[PDB]
Structures are given as structure tokens and as C-alpha cells.
């Protein structure tokens, strides 16, 4: 689901993922840290640029 | 007189009488704690 959201949009909201997947906060954080970085006032951004 | 204990992983109420080898049904675990007392206890908020 996280990867599909990243395909759909470059920015992913952590709270939305937590709500949709019903998963705990730390598991969502582990999912995001593998492929995303925190950008303040914008959420989580994909770590690599569009190639 | 029903003496009741709680095993460490089943957490099920087991009634065992005196001089019984400590075990539990639906397990084999052998740490058998005692349930909390029913007597009222008064505590001070200090």
C-alpha cells in the first residue's frame, strides 16, 4: 500500500497510512524509513528523485 | 477447599490440592503463581 501510494503521489501522509492499514505507528515508520524521508510541512517524500 | 493458581503462560485458573506435582492442563509449564487476595487493602495517597 505504501509503495502504491508513492507511485500515485510523491508525498505520503503517515497518519493516512496508519488509518488505512490499521497498523501500529512504529511499523508504518519502518515502512516509510526504508524508502522515504521526512520533509517538514510536506510529510514524507520519496528518498530518490524521479528518474 | 478450592485452592486456585495461575500458570505462567496459559494464565488459566488451575485448582490443585496438596502434594501435587506442579503442572498445568493444556500446557506443561511449571511456574505456578498464586492469585491475588480478596481482602480489602487500604492505601495512602502520600
Amino acid at each position: 500500500f505504501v509503495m502504491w501510494k508513492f507511485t500515485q503521489s510523491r508525498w505520503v501522509v503517515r497518519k493516512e497510512v496508519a488509518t488505512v492499514t490499521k497498523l501500529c505507528a512504529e511499523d508504518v515508520k519502518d515502512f516509510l524509513e526504508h524508502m522515504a524521508v521526512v520533509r517538514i510541512n510536506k510529510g514524507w517524500e520519496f528518498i530518490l528523485p524521479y528518474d | 477447599q478450592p485452592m486456585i493458581y495461575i500458570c505462567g503462560e496459559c494464565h488459566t485458573e488451575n485448582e490443585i490440592k496438596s502434594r501435587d506435582p506442579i503442572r498445568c492442563r493444556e500446557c506443561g509449564y511449571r511456574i505456578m503463581y498464586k492469585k491475588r487476595t480478596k481482602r480489602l487493602v487500604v492505601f495512602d495517597a502520600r
Partner: protein
């Protein structure tokens, strides 16, 4: 183990501001602006919330259940 109800120095009620604080961390808020939004002006309550470790759920993972 768990968040203290009162701030140690001043005495402001800080126990009820813990989980909401986590929500602000579940949101995009930084630590400082989340503390500001919670209304902790003096730095003692900010130290209370910022330096607290939530060991209660880790201990509950070892609870009998």
C-alpha cells in the same frame, strides 16, 4: 514507566497532554511547535513531556494477559 500526572516543579496538569502530544508526533509537527501548541509555556512542562519515555506499553508486552 508511565507519564506523571503533575509536573514536578510547577505542578501543572501534564498527564492528560501525553497521548495528544503523540498525535502531534503522529502528525507532521516538530517537538517544539507541538509543545507550543499543547500550551506548555515554561520549560519545566516541556522537559516533562519531552524527556518522558513511555515504558508502559513495552512492559505490557510482558504482561500476563
Amino acid at each position: 514507566m508511565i507519564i506523571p500526572v503533575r509536573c514536578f516543579t510547577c505542578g501543572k496538569i501534564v498527564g492528560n497532554k501525553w497521548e495528544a502530544y503523540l498525535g502531534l508526533l503522529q502528525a507532521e509537527y516538530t517537538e517544539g511547535d507541538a509543545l507550543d501548541a499543547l500550551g506548555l509555556k515554561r520549560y519545566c512542562c516541556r522537559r516533562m513531556l519531552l524527556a518522558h519515555v513511555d515504558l508502559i506499553e513495552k512492559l505490557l508486552n510482558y504482561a500476563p494477559l
